[PDB]
Ligand binder design. Structure first.
Ligand SMILES: CC(=O)N[C@@H]1[C@@H](O)[C@H](O)[C@@H](CO)O[C@H]1O
Ligand SMILES: [Ca+2]
Length: 216
């Protein structure tokens, strides 16, 4: 690197006009292949989580969220080292794109988004809600560790992850649960869906969810 591309924004600027898997060089100069959203909100986004059809188990242990899981063809989670590697110098706006089972689109936009290395538990450190029709359902979670069903760092007696069946920056427990189960719309189970509270509440699992970052 030094010669190559360092962000999706960079690849947009080089005239990569369609979304897809391209290879950016991280700050450590290691190469990572990522999904570039070249479209939404003027494009240039590096997509780090994607749900879209129910095909992948997001109910995953710590190691599995450390490395990343899923498929390039479908849903995935880029992995918590990669995510940290991504947002750990400079600063990255965060966007969250949601789409329901009727194609009513919603988003939410934050001015900075960054996350701790494994040691500091991949602690979330989020800036300021900018806008978006889904409302703020991410600030609540600011300054929290990341947990999973086999690694509890939550401020609730029990296991937020085990009870709401996800992986997240879980306090007591959440307002957002984008890694929860794919429950395809209305659900009677309580909050263990792909949920964004201000978005569509604790009983409705979105059809698409995307979380992405561009350099501000
Ligand atoms: C990046 C990609 O291919 N996925 C798209 C993306 O442009 C967008 O985030 C979302 C609505 O914004 O719809 C997704 O399916
Ligand atoms: Ca706990």
């Amino acid at each position: 690197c030094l010669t190559g591309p360092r962000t999706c924004k960079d690849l947009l600027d080089r005239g990569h006009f369609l979304s897809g898997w391209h290879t950016i060089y991280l700050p450590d100069c290691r190469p990572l292949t990522v999904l570039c959203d070249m479209d939404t909100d003027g494009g240039g986004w590096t997509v780090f989580q994607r749900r879209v059809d129910g095909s992948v188990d997001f109910y995953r242990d710590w190691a599995t969220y450390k490395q990343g899981f899923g498929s390039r063809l479908g849903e995935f989670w880029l992995g918590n080292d990669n995510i940290h590697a991504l947002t750990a110098q400079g600063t990255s706006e965060l966007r969250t794109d949601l789409v329901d089972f009727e194609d009513n689109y919603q988003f939410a936009k934050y001015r900075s988004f960054r996350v701790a290395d494994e040691a500091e538990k991949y602690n979330l450190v989020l800036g300021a809600f900018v806008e978006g029709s889904a409302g703020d359902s991410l600030t609540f979670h600011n300054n929290q560790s990341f947990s999973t069903k086999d690694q509890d760092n939550d401020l609730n007696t029990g296991n937020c992850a085990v009870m709401f069946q996800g992986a997240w920056w879980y306090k007591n427990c959440h307002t957002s649960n984008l890694n929860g189960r794919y429950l395809r719309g209305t659900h009677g189970s309580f909050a263990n869906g792909i949920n964004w509270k201000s978005g569509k509440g604790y009983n409705y699992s979105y059809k698409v969810s995307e979380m992405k970052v561009r350099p501000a």
